[PDB]
């Protein structure tokens, strides 16, 4: 068999394992954390997708920033991100985290969490519905499904 065929299928096996076992670390900072709890509640039950309710920072694959990131909180956020073992993804939930939202023009609010850490998915709303955050999580799964780490290493 060809080398380009084994790498293509190995890429699908690692992608399948990674997107089927996303363990999130939730930074519940503000009202957006309430909607994140309703995604774990029986109506939607994130756990049935493989997404565990709560995970410790060192056992986690995705960081969900749900609430307003203040200037007194930003260094703590970056520290937790740097200690996440890779691969690691960040989901930005709500207007506050995306761009500052209602407090954009405040002196004590970071205008968007994407200028502190890299962001993979933006979930809009104030707050996003629990069915809108779930749609974002399933959109991160498909993004991980398109990764081609092994198919790019083989062509180096």
Ligand X SMILES: CCCCCCCCCCCC(=O)OC[C@H](COP(=O)(O)OCC[N+](C)(C)C)OC(=O)CCCCCCCCCCC
Feature table: binding site for [4Fe-4S] cluster: 31-32, 96, 126
* Nearest partner of 118 among 79, 95, 89, judged by Cα: 89
Largest CA distance in the chain: 61
C-beta closer to another protein: residue 2 or 140:
140
Omega prior to 145 cis, within 30 of 0: no
C-alpha to C-alpha distance for 151 and 86, rounded to whole angstroms? 19
DSSP 83-111: TSPSS-EEEEEHHHHHH-GGGTT-TTB-S
Do residues 8 and 154 touch, judged by C-beta distance below 8 A?
no
Query: Per CB under 6 A, which of residues 12..51 are in contact with ligand PC1?
Result: 12-13, 16
| Least distance in angstroms from the C-beta of 24 to ligand SF4 | 17
Taking the complex as a whole, the smallest distance from the CB of residue 125 to another protein amounts, in Å, to 6
Among 56, 82, 155, 156, indicate the residue that binds another protein (CB under 8 A): 56
d(Cα 91, Cα 149) in Å, to the nearest integer?
21
Residues 93-152 that bind another protein (CB under 8 A): 95, 98-102, 104-105, 112, 114, 119-126, 128-132, 134-136, 138-139, 143
Q: Which stretch binds another protein (CB under 8 A): 1-9, 36-44, 64-72, 73-81?
A: 36-44
Please enumerate in sequence order all residues whose Cβ is within 8 A of that of 74, keeping only pairs 6 or more positions apart, or say none. Answer: 110, 116
Closest separation in Å from C-beta 95 to another protein: 5
Cα separation, 69 vs 5, in Å, equals: 45
* Contact of residue 42 among another protein, ligand X, ligand PC1, none (CB under 5-8 Å per partner type): another protein
Q: Which residues bind another protein (CB under 8 A)?
A: 13-14, 16-18, 20-21, 41-45, 47-50, 56, 58-59, 61, 83, 85-87, 95, 98-102, 104-105, 112, 114, 119-126, 128-132, 134-136, 138-139, 143
């Amino acid at each position: 068999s060809r080398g380009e065929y084994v790498v293509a299928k190995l890429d699908d096996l690692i992608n399948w394992a990674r997107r089927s076992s996303l363990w999130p670390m939730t930074f519940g900072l503000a009202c957006c954390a309430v909607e994140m709890m309703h995604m774990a509640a029986p109506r939607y039950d994130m756990d049935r997708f493989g997404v565990v309710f709560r995970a410790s920072p060192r056992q986690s694959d995705v960081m969900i920033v749900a609430g307003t990131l203040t200037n007194k909180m930003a260094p703590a956020l970056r520290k937790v991100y740097d200690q996440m073992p890779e691969p690691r993804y960040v989901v930005s939930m709500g207007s506050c985290a995306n761009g500052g939202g209602y407090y954009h023009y405040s002196y004590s609010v970071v205008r968007g969490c994407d200028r502190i850490v890299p962001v993979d998915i933006y979930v809009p709303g104030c707050p996003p519905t629990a069915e809108a955050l779930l749609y974002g999580i399933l959109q991160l799964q498909k993004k991980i499904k398109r990764e081609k780490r092994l198919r790019i290493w083989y062509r180096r």
